[PDB]
Design a protein around this ligand. Structure first.
Ligand SMILES: [Ca+2]
Ligand SMILES: [Ca+2]
Ligand SMILES: [Ca+2]
Ligand SMILES: [Ca+2]
Ligand SMILES: [Ca+2]
Ligand SMILES: [Ca+2]
Ligand SMILES: [Ca+2]
Ligand SMILES: [Ca+2]
Ligand SMILES: [Cl-]
Ligand SMILES: [Cl-]
Lengths: 92, 88, 87, 89
């Protein structure tokens, strides 16, 4: 009964939750949680970026629009849209 | 091996493709196509806005179509809303 | 040598940065920054909508800022409207 | 008195028009008009693509969302935004 799109969104949310709850505020990602999520769950889409810890750091800084050193889900979803676009583009 | 998260992102592209292929330009979803997408793919709290209201919101360049990057606005808003729900 | 069209596109990025560099995250334009942007950069037929209405319309992810891709929504709407006016 | 953003948008409109007006509907780009504009005015941004006429045709076809073999300004501006984004990145 859950649609294809709804399942994909639930996958995103559950993956964010998996890491956000490890430490600190349970609904945001701190830097270490973000790094863990990217290294494991985006090991292909961010393969080049993962090779440099400082690049992963800059991506989180850029996403962290209220500059509180954590990523809310609202902040994080923008990465998801950007990566979906990037994947769409390279399947040309 | 793509991860489950990566496969979910690629699946989002596939959802869009399901509807852009119905008619016309295959990189465009038109008013009725979006109505069908909202009806099949989105929850009631998203649908209740109205397909025409969503179309006007998503068609940034007002060319009468919703392209993939415009569709991503809906996906972001759906994501943000579902996340709110999952802890409420 | 960039063409004049190409320089125009690069200049759109410069306009965003004039405002995104005011405070906080350098990839973010906050609600007060966006008000200054509309007042300085956009014509009356764009400004009259009001900075709060525009901010709500551009802040797609509701994170309290307008990023560069969100700002491009405003650029598209301003271009379409300007094009209408010019004829 | 024109702002920087306004000047840049005027440059876009006037570039579109330089080509749209030459032939056919005066406010849309037909295929030859789009090709000319891309060839000359996007010679750097679309340098690789310009080497293949079929690539340019496909770009236009993608942008042509009402499938009328012409780009309106509405359709064309989506390219300008994509290109600004690509330059930014
Ligand atoms: Ca946390
Ligand atoms: Ca934050
Ligand atoms: Ca279609
Ligand atoms: Ca559109
Ligand atoms: Ca800023
Ligand atoms: Ca935002
Ligand atoms: Ca023409
Ligand atoms: Ca057309
Ligand atoms: Cl049609
Ligand atoms: Cl701040």
């Amino acid at each position: 009964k859950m649609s294809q799109l709804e399942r994909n969104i639930e996958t995103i949310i559950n993956t964010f939750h998996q890491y956000s709850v490890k430490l600190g505020h349970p609904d945001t990602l701190n830097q270490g949680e973000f790094k863990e999520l990217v290294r494991k769950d985006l090991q292909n889409f961010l393969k080049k970026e993962n090779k440099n810890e400082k690049v992963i750091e800059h991506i989180m800084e850029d996403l962290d629009t209220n500059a509180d050193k954590q990523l809310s889900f609202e902040e994080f979803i923008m990465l998801m849209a950007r990566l979906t676009w990037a994947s769409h583009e390279k399947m040309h | 091996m793509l991860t489950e998260l990566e496969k979910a992102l690629n699946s989002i592209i596939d959802v869009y493709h399901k509807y852009s292929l119905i008619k016309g330009n295959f990189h465009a979803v038109y008013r009725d196509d979006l109505k069908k997408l909202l009806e099949t793919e989105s929850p009631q709290y998203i649908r209740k806005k109205g397909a025409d209201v969503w179309f006007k919101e998503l068609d940034i360049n007002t060319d009468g179509a919703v392209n993939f990057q415009e569709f991503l606005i809906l996906v972001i808003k759906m994501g943000v809303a579902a996340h709110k729900k999952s802890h409420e």
